[PDB]
Design a protein around this ligand. Structure first.
Ligand SMILES: Cc1cc2nc3c(=O)[nH]c(=O)nc-3n(C[C@H](O)[C@H](O)[C@H](O)COP(=O)(O)OP(=O)(O)OC[C@H]3O[C@@H](n4cnc5c(N)ncnc54)[C@H](O)[C@@H]3O)c2cc1C
Ligand SMILES: *N(O)c1c(C)c(C(F)(F)F)cc2nc(C3=N[C@H](C(=O)N4CCCC4)CO3)sc12
Length: 413
């Protein structure tokens, strides 16, 4: 092991600890058990490609097990739609291996450079959340390495269904996911057909997302404005699409269907049925929150608060979430989700602390993947069933040999 201080993706909150990089499966197993004996000291935390901005992947003075050397793809079946992978395999890797089977990764985030281990541990969501939900909805079985040195085979139903949905979005505190089986989405091509729309106000963006035209597309998101003053505030560049069928694909592309390789602003944004690949279709404080669908006025308010703030975010992603899964600590809930990132300035930390209160007041929540600064008080209140979740954690890990900086910060230990 090499003693390395580790930060999030946004180069924040360094945590000096040991990095255990090994492809060997049983060398990992021993490290944990040989740690559990001594007792939860600093404990240990699994780490993927470190794409979450938070201190969820960092341990301070403890052990940080790197999962990336354990990246075996065991089997891909095209008939059963099943994929059996080690937790250390990434999505870019998996997406490339699945296409020759005519299979697509069920949930894709922004960057594909995320591991399966980290994908479940955050219960990550994508552009098709309104149609497919989060990543945990597609996990069929996990092989979790618990605290006592044993490995438990978990599933959505039956035994360990309680521990399963705890690991889904459990930020790696329940254990170390070693091996996962994923349900895949079948596909005829590796392309998308998209409909482009440009709104001129927040009211348009909301109406467009609520008039039921969303039921026409599987994938959808919106590049929106949070700087411009009302009524220009909230105006969005919407990108809504669907997986392309072999028939829909232009004459040249059909040959290799599964291969991988202010007026001006409005008209360029507006189009219909346009065929485009995955790449085309897809210092600073990153901030993400969701607000329940029925609380639309309160949402209109937060955007205005952001507008008047004196803080100017330009990278602004807008999304309407679909139904939630049954995971206690899953971030997504049916509502208006938006991410913003601000430039670090004076009074930012206190302003976002007011957005915490404001978001909490309307029954929404923040995403653990992007959080490094919300309090334990705010987090716990944002997540009902957090107590339920903790009572499960004490059964599986009663020594606190699984602990990250976040778990200490949010008192989830
Ligand atoms: C540019 C960019 C865009 C993004 N877009 C999105 C998006 O649209 N939607 C979205 O939901 N997220 C998004 N993310 C965040 C990212 O998808 C998640 O935070 C993801 O979980 C990080 O994966 P990772 O492998 O890097 O895990 P890490 O960041 O290394 O660790 C995060 C968590 O995963 C856990 N973990 C990792 N491996 C294991 C294992 N084997 N066993 C147990 N626990 C484990 C850790 O305990 C930790 O709590 C984005 C990130 C970036 C940088
Ligand atoms: N918020 O950070 C966020 C959200 C909420 C969503 C979605 F759709 F789930 F609501 C998607 C999403 N995608 C993000 C991202 N896209 C960027 C990207 O790929 N680029 C293309 C142009 C600029 C960079 C990087 O991360 S953030 C995000």
């Amino acid at each position: 092991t090499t003693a390395t201080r580790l930060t999030g993706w946004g180069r924040t909150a360094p945590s000096v600890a040991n990095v255990l990089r090994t492809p060997d499966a049983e060398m990992i197993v021993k490290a944990v058990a040989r740690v559990a004996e001594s007792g939860g000291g600093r404990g240990a935390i699994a780490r993927g490609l470190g794409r979450s901005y938070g201190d969820n992947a960092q341990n301070g003075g403890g052990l940080v097990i790197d999962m990336t050397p354990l990246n075996t793809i065991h089997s891909i079946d095209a008939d059963t739609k099943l994929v059996d992978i080690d937790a250390g395999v990434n999505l870019d890797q998996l997406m490339k291996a699945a296409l020759p089977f005519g299979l697509w990764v069920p949930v894709l985030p922004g960057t594909r450079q995320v591991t399966v281990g980290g994908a479940i541990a955050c219960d990550i969501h994508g552009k098709n959340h309104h149609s497919a939900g989060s990543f945990g909805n597609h996990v069929r079985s996990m092989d979790l390495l618990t605290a006592d040195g044993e490995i438990r085979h978990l599933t959505p139903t039956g035994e360990d269904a309680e521990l399963f949905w705890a690991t889904v979005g459990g930020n790696g505190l329940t254990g170390i996911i070693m091996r996962a089986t994923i349900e895949m989405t079948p596909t005829s091509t590796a392309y998308f057909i998209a409909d482009g729309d440009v709104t001129a106000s927040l009211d348009e963006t909301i109406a467009l997302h609520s008039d039921g035209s969303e039921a026409r597309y599987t994938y959808s998101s919106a590049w929106f404005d949070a700087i411009s003053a009302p009524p220009k505030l909230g105006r969005a560049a919407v990108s809504r699409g669907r997986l392309a069928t072999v028939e829909q694909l232009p004459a040249k592309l059909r040959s290799e269907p599964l291969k991988f390789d202010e007026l001006w602003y409005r008209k360029s944004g507006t189009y219909r049925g346009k065929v485009q690949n995955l790449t085309q279709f897809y210092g600073f404080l990153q901030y993400q929150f969701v607000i329940p669908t029925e609380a639309v006025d309160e949402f209109k308010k937060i955007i205005g608060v952001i507008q008047a703030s004196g803080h100017y975010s330009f990278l602004n992603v807008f999304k309407l979430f679909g139904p939630r899964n049954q995971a206690p600590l899953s971030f997504p809930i049916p509502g208006w989700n938006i991410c913003v990132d601000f430039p670090i300035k004076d009074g930012l930390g206190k302003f976002v602390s007011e957005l915490d209160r404001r978001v909490l007041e309307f029954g929404g929540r923040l995403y653990t993947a992007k959080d490094s600064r919300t309090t334990a008080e705010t987090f716990h209140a944002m997540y009902p069933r957090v107590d339920e979740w903790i009572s499960v954690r004490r059964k599986v890990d009663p020594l606190r040999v699984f602990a990250s900086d976040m778990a200490r910060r949010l008192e989830l230990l």
